[PDB]
Short mmCIF file of all heavy atoms in Angstrom, two decimals:
data_model
loop_
_atom_site.label_atom_id
_atom_site.label_comp_id
_atom_site.label_asym_id
_atom_site.label_seq_id
_atom_site.Cartn_x
_atom_site.Cartn_y
_atom_site.Cartn_z
N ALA A 1 -37.66 3.48 25.88
CA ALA A 1 -37.86 3.42 24.38
C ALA A 1 -37.23 2.22 23.83
O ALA A 1 -36.14 1.83 24.31
CB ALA A 1 -37.26 4.78 23.79
N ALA A 2 -37.90 1.67 22.79
CA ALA A 2 -37.44 0.33 22.22
C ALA A 2 -36.06 0.43 21.69
O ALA A 2 -35.43 -0.64 21.62
CB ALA A 2 -38.51 -0.09 21.22
N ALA A 3 -35.54 1.57 21.28
CA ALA A 3 -34.31 1.63 20.75
C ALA A 3 -33.21 1.69 21.79
O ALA A 3 -32.01 1.49 21.55
CB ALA A 3 -34.07 2.99 19.87
N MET A 4 -33.50 1.71 23.08
CA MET A 4 -32.53 1.73 24.12
C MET A 4 -31.96 0.24 24.29
O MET A 4 -32.49 -0.66 23.82
CB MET A 4 -33.04 2.13 25.48
CG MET A 4 -33.53 3.62 25.55
SD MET A 4 -34.36 4.08 26.95
CE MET A 4 -34.81 5.86 26.65
N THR A 5 -30.82 0.17 24.94
CA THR A 5 -30.11 -1.13 24.91
C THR A 5 -29.54 -1.51 26.26
O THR A 5 -29.59 -0.65 27.23
CB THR A 5 -28.90 -1.10 23.92
OG1 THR A 5 -27.94 -0.16 24.39
CG2 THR A 5 -29.31 -0.84 22.52
N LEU A 6 -28.97 -2.67 26.39
CA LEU A 6 -28.20 -3.04 27.56
C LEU A 6 -27.14 -2.06 27.93
O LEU A 6 -27.07 -1.54 28.95
CB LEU A 6 -27.61 -4.41 27.35
CG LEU A 6 -28.57 -5.63 27.54
CD1 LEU A 6 -27.87 -6.92 27.35
CD2 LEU A 6 -29.22 -5.57 28.82
N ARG A 7 -26.26 -1.80 26.82
CA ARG A 7 -25.24 -0.78 26.94
C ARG A 7 -25.85 0.53 27.56
O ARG A 7 -25.36 1.07 28.55
CB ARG A 7 -24.60 -0.47 25.57
CG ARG A 7 -23.46 0.39 25.58
CD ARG A 7 -22.81 0.61 24.25
NE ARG A 7 -22.21 1.96 24.27
CZ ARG A 7 -22.72 2.99 23.71
NH1 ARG A 7 -23.93 2.92 23.07
NH2 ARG A 7 -22.13 4.18 23.76
N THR A 8 -26.95 1.02 26.98
CA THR A 8 -27.49 2.32 27.31
C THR A 8 -27.95 2.30 28.65
O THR A 8 -27.87 3.37 29.41
CB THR A 8 -28.52 2.61 26.30
OG1 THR A 8 -27.88 3.12 24.99
CG2 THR A 8 -29.69 3.49 26.75
N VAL A 9 -28.68 1.20 29.13
CA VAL A 9 -29.17 1.24 30.45
C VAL A 9 -27.95 1.18 31.44
O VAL A 9 -27.91 2.09 32.41
CB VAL A 9 -29.97 -0.14 30.65
CG1 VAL A 9 -30.09 -0.27 32.16
CG2 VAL A 9 -31.23 0.04 30.00
N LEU A 10 -26.86 0.48 31.20
CA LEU A 10 -25.74 0.49 32.10
C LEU A 10 -25.06 1.82 32.25
O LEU A 10 -24.70 2.36 33.40
CB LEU A 10 -24.69 -0.59 31.65
CG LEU A 10 -25.12 -2.03 31.66
CD1 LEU A 10 -24.13 -2.83 31.02
CD2 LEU A 10 -25.27 -2.42 33.15
N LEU A 11 -24.84 2.55 31.05
CA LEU A 11 -24.30 3.87 31.19
C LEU A 11 -25.27 4.92 31.77
O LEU A 11 -24.71 5.89 32.34
CB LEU A 11 -23.77 4.39 29.75
CG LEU A 11 -22.86 3.51 29.09
CD1 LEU A 11 -22.89 3.73 27.61
CD2 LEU A 11 -21.46 3.58 29.76
N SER A 12 -26.53 4.72 31.66
CA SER A 12 -27.46 5.55 32.28
C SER A 12 -27.42 5.30 33.76
O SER A 12 -27.57 6.30 34.61
CB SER A 12 -28.93 5.35 31.84
OG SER A 12 -28.84 5.70 30.41
N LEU A 13 -27.19 4.08 34.24
CA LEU A 13 -27.10 3.78 35.65
C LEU A 13 -25.83 4.35 36.28
O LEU A 13 -25.83 4.81 37.38
CB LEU A 13 -27.23 2.25 35.92
CG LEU A 13 -28.66 1.75 35.75
CD1 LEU A 13 -28.70 0.21 35.69
CD2 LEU A 13 -29.65 2.39 36.69
N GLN A 14 -24.82 4.34 35.45
CA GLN A 14 -23.56 5.05 35.89
C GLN A 14 -23.74 6.55 35.92
O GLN A 14 -23.36 7.22 36.92
CB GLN A 14 -22.38 4.66 34.88
CG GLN A 14 -21.10 4.96 35.39
CD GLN A 14 -20.14 4.53 34.38
OE1 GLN A 14 -20.31 4.94 33.18
NE2 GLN A 14 -19.09 3.78 34.70
N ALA A 15 -24.44 7.12 35.02
CA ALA A 15 -24.70 8.55 35.06
C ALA A 15 -25.55 8.94 36.26
O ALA A 15 -25.41 9.96 36.86
CB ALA A 15 -25.27 9.00 33.75
N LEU A 16 -26.45 8.09 36.57
CA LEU A 16 -27.31 8.42 37.79
C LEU A 16 -26.44 8.42 39.04
O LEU A 16 -26.76 9.34 39.89
CB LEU A 16 -28.37 7.18 37.87
CG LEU A 16 -29.26 7.29 39.19
CD1 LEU A 16 -30.09 8.52 39.20
CD2 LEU A 16 -30.11 5.95 39.36
N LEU A 17 -25.29 7.64 39.17
CA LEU A 17 -24.50 7.73 40.27
C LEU A 17 -23.82 9.16 40.36
O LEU A 17 -23.69 9.69 41.39
CB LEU A 17 -23.44 6.64 40.30
CG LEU A 17 -23.77 5.16 40.32
CD1 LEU A 17 -22.73 4.26 41.01
CD2 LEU A 17 -25.26 4.79 40.93
N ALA A 18 -23.37 9.53 39.24
CA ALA A 18 -22.74 11.02 39.19
C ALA A 18 -23.75 11.99 39.25
O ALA A 18 -23.32 13.22 39.54
CB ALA A 18 -21.91 11.14 37.82
N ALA A 19 -24.99 11.82 39.01
CA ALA A 19 -26.06 12.89 39.03
C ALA A 19 -27.28 12.35 39.71
O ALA A 19 -28.29 12.11 39.10
CB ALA A 19 -26.31 13.34 37.55
N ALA A 20 -27.29 12.39 41.00
CA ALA A 20 -28.52 12.04 41.80
C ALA A 20 -29.61 13.06 41.60
O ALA A 20 -29.30 14.30 41.55
CB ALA A 20 -28.15 11.92 43.29
N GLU A 21 -30.91 12.64 41.57
CA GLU A 21 -32.00 13.47 41.43
C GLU A 21 -32.83 13.30 42.68
O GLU A 21 -33.71 12.53 42.90
CB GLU A 21 -32.88 13.16 40.23
CG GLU A 21 -32.17 13.07 38.92
CD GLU A 21 -32.91 13.83 37.81
OE1 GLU A 21 -32.98 15.07 37.87
OE2 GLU A 21 -33.30 13.28 36.79
N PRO A 22 -32.62 14.17 43.73
CA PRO A 22 -33.06 13.91 45.13
C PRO A 22 -34.58 14.17 45.23
O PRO A 22 -35.14 13.82 46.32
CB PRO A 22 -32.24 14.73 46.07
CG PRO A 22 -31.23 15.45 45.07
CD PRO A 22 -31.77 15.35 43.81
N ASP A 23 -35.25 15.07 44.37
CA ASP A 23 -36.62 15.24 44.46
C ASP A 23 -37.51 14.13 43.48
O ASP A 23 -38.69 14.32 43.38
CB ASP A 23 -36.96 16.61 44.10
CG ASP A 23 -36.26 17.59 44.85
OD1 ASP A 23 -36.35 17.57 46.18
OD2 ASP A 23 -35.36 18.49 44.27
N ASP A 24 -36.81 13.16 42.97
CA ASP A 24 -37.51 11.99 42.63
C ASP A 24 -36.78 10.84 43.34
O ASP A 24 -36.07 9.96 42.91
CB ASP A 24 -37.31 11.68 41.07
CG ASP A 24 -38.18 10.46 40.71
OD1 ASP A 24 -39.01 10.05 41.44
OD2 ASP A 24 -37.93 9.89 39.56
N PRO A 25 -36.93 10.86 44.80
CA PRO A 25 -36.16 9.86 45.63
C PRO A 25 -36.77 8.48 45.56
O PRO A 25 -38.00 8.18 45.32
CB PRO A 25 -36.45 10.53 47.02
CG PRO A 25 -37.79 11.10 46.92
CD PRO A 25 -37.85 11.65 45.53
N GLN A 26 -35.90 7.56 45.79
CA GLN A 26 -36.20 6.26 46.18
C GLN A 26 -36.02 5.92 47.62
O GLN A 26 -37.03 5.43 48.29
CB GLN A 26 -35.30 5.28 45.41
CG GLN A 26 -35.40 3.79 45.86
CD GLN A 26 -36.80 3.28 45.45
OE1 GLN A 26 -37.32 3.74 44.49
NE2 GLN A 26 -37.36 2.35 46.27
N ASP A 27 -34.99 6.44 48.29
CA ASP A 27 -34.79 6.23 49.61
C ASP A 27 -34.83 7.68 50.33
O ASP A 27 -34.03 8.46 50.27
CB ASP A 27 -33.30 5.74 49.91
CG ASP A 27 -33.25 5.03 51.28
OD1 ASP A 27 -33.35 5.59 52.27
OD2 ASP A 27 -33.02 3.73 51.14
N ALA A 28 -36.08 7.81 50.94
CA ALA A 28 -36.37 9.03 51.66
C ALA A 28 -35.26 9.44 52.68
O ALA A 28 -34.78 10.56 52.74
CB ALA A 28 -37.63 9.00 52.50
N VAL A 29 -34.68 8.39 53.41
CA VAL A 29 -33.77 8.68 54.46
C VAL A 29 -32.36 9.13 53.81
O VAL A 29 -31.79 10.07 54.24
CB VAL A 29 -33.57 7.37 55.28
CG1 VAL A 29 -32.33 7.57 56.25
CG2 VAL A 29 -34.76 6.99 56.15
N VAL A 30 -32.05 8.41 52.75
CA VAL A 30 -30.87 8.89 52.02
C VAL A 30 -30.94 10.32 51.39
O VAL A 30 -30.17 11.13 51.46
CB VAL A 30 -30.36 7.85 51.00
CG1 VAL A 30 -29.20 8.34 50.18
CG2 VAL A 30 -30.08 6.47 51.62
N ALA A 31 -32.17 10.48 50.81
CA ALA A 31 -32.35 11.77 50.09
C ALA A 31 -32.41 12.98 51.06
O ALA A 31 -31.94 14.08 50.66
CB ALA A 31 -33.74 11.70 49.24
N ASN A 32 -33.05 12.80 52.22
CA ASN A 32 -32.93 13.88 53.18
C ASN A 32 -31.61 14.18 53.60
O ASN A 32 -31.10 15.26 53.72
CB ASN A 32 -33.91 13.61 54.32
CG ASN A 32 -35.39 13.58 53.97
OD1 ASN A 32 -35.73 14.04 52.86
ND2 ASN A 32 -36.30 13.00 54.78
N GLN A 33 -30.85 13.09 53.98
CA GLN A 33 -29.40 13.32 54.25
C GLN A 33 -28.61 14.04 53.13
O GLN A 33 -27.79 14.86 53.38
CB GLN A 33 -28.63 12.10 54.65
CG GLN A 33 -27.27 12.15 55.04
CD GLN A 33 -26.51 10.93 55.33
OE1 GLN A 33 -26.07 10.22 54.45
NE2 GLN A 33 -26.69 10.48 56.63
N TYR A 34 -28.83 13.55 51.88
CA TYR A 34 -28.34 14.17 50.73
C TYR A 34 -28.57 15.65 50.70
O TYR A 34 -27.67 16.43 50.70
CB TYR A 34 -28.92 13.58 49.48
CG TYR A 34 -28.23 14.01 48.17
CD1 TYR A 34 -27.14 13.32 47.68
CD2 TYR A 34 -28.68 15.10 47.37
CE1 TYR A 34 -26.48 13.76 46.52
CE2 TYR A 34 -28.08 15.41 46.27
CZ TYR A 34 -26.98 14.72 45.78
OH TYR A 34 -26.40 15.26 44.68
N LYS A 35 -29.77 16.20 50.93
CA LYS A 35 -30.17 17.52 50.83
C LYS A 35 -29.69 18.33 52.09
O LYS A 35 -29.14 19.44 51.91
CB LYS A 35 -31.69 17.71 50.69
CG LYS A 35 -32.18 18.77 49.98
CD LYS A 35 -33.22 18.50 48.80
CE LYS A 35 -32.96 19.34 47.64
NZ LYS A 35 -34.05 19.14 46.52
N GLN A 36 -29.98 17.81 53.39
CA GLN A 36 -29.72 18.49 54.56
C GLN A 36 -28.31 18.69 54.96
O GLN A 36 -27.85 19.71 55.41
CB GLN A 36 -30.57 17.85 55.66
CG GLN A 36 -31.97 18.22 55.58
CD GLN A 36 -32.85 17.10 56.34
OE1 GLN A 36 -33.98 16.67 55.84
NE2 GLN A 36 -32.40 16.65 57.55
N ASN A 37 -27.45 17.56 54.92
CA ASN A 37 -26.07 17.59 55.19
C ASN A 37 -25.25 16.92 54.13
O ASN A 37 -24.89 15.77 54.24
CB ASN A 37 -25.79 16.82 56.48
CG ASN A 37 -24.47 16.95 57.08
OD1 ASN A 37 -23.60 17.53 56.40
ND2 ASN A 37 -24.25 16.42 58.26
N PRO A 38 -25.00 17.64 52.93
CA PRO A 38 -24.32 17.06 51.86
C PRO A 38 -22.96 16.42 52.15
O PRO A 38 -22.65 15.22 51.69
CB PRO A 38 -24.09 18.28 50.99
CG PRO A 38 -25.34 19.11 51.28
CD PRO A 38 -25.67 18.92 52.63
N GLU A 39 -22.11 17.02 53.10
CA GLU A 39 -20.87 16.35 53.31
C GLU A 39 -20.96 15.03 54.10
O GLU A 39 -20.15 14.09 53.86
CB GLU A 39 -19.91 17.29 54.11
CG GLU A 39 -18.41 16.79 54.48
CD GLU A 39 -17.71 16.58 53.17
OE1 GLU A 39 -17.95 17.30 52.16
OE2 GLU A 39 -16.71 15.73 53.08
N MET A 40 -22.01 14.84 54.93
CA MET A 40 -22.17 13.57 55.59
C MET A 40 -22.63 12.48 54.54
O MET A 40 -22.14 11.40 54.58
CB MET A 40 -23.22 13.71 56.74
CG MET A 40 -23.50 12.41 57.47
SD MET A 40 -24.76 12.63 58.70
CE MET A 40 -23.67 13.25 59.98
N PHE A 41 -23.61 12.83 53.71
CA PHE A 41 -23.90 11.95 52.63
C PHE A 41 -22.74 11.54 51.79
O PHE A 41 -22.54 10.39 51.49
CB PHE A 41 -24.96 12.71 51.64
CG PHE A 41 -25.15 11.84 50.36
CD1 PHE A 41 -25.97 10.82 50.38
CD2 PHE A 41 -24.27 12.14 49.24
CE1 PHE A 41 -26.20 10.02 49.17
CE2 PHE A 41 -24.47 11.32 48.15
CZ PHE A 41 -25.36 10.34 48.08
N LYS A 42 -21.87 12.47 51.44
CA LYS A 42 -20.72 12.12 50.58
C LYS A 42 -19.81 11.15 51.32
O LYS A 42 -19.38 10.09 50.80
CB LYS A 42 -19.87 13.36 50.32
CG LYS A 42 -18.53 13.31 49.78
CD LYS A 42 -18.08 14.73 49.41
CE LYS A 42 -16.49 14.72 49.27
NZ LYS A 42 -16.10 15.80 48.25
N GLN A 43 -19.51 11.40 52.69
CA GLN A 43 -18.62 10.50 53.42
C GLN A 43 -19.36 9.14 53.78
O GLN A 43 -18.62 8.14 53.83
CB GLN A 43 -18.29 11.19 54.77
CG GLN A 43 -17.12 12.24 54.51
CD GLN A 43 -15.99 11.83 53.65
OE1 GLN A 43 -15.40 10.61 53.77
NE2 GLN A 43 -15.51 12.64 52.82
N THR A 44 -20.68 9.27 53.93
CA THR A 44 -21.42 8.02 54.14
C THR A 44 -21.39 7.06 52.89
O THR A 44 -21.11 5.91 52.92
CB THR A 44 -22.90 8.21 54.67
OG1 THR A 44 -22.90 9.05 55.82
CG2 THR A 44 -23.56 6.90 54.89
N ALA A 45 -21.62 7.76 51.73
CA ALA A 45 -21.57 7.02 50.54
C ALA A 45 -20.22 6.50 50.20
O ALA A 45 -20.00 5.32 49.79
CB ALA A 45 -22.11 7.90 49.32
N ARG A 46 -19.21 7.29 50.40
CA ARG A 46 -17.75 6.83 50.30
C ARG A 46 -17.63 5.68 51.27
O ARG A 46 -16.86 4.69 50.87
CB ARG A 46 -16.83 8.01 50.59
CG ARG A 46 -15.46 7.81 49.76
CD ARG A 46 -14.80 9.15 49.51
NE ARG A 46 -14.53 9.72 50.97
CZ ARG A 46 -13.58 9.49 51.70
NH1 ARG A 46 -12.67 8.55 51.30
NH2 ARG A 46 -13.36 9.96 52.86
N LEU A 47 -18.12 5.64 52.40
CA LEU A 47 -18.00 4.49 53.36
C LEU A 47 -18.63 3.31 52.73
O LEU A 47 -18.05 2.20 52.79
CB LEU A 47 -18.52 4.87 54.66
CG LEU A 47 -18.85 3.64 55.47
CD1 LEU A 47 -17.60 3.13 56.13
CD2 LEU A 47 -19.87 3.69 56.50
#
């Protein structure tokens, strides 16, 4: 929307990190690991 901003995009990208949407995936390989083995995703992402 035209009213959105640089600020707003950046905080939305930060919110995306705290709230992944795995059934609108970008990386099928990551999203399957996210869904199937959550703790491994968490430790891989932390890595």
Side-chain angles (χ1 to χ4, degrees):
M4 295 169 183
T5 65
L6 284 182
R7 187 180 151 260
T8 278
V9 167
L10 292 172
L11 304 160
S12 299
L13 289 172
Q14 198 179 48
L16 175 63
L17 304 205
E21 309 228 65
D23 308 299
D24 188 16
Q26 174 66 32
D27 205 292
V29 172
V30 179
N32 294 344
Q33 179 187 88
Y34 188 87
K35 211 134 216 189
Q36 285 155 221
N37 187 357
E39 184 62 30
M40 178 183 278
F41 167 85
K42 164 175 162 152
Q43 285 311 318
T44 306
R46 211 158 55 84
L47 161 84

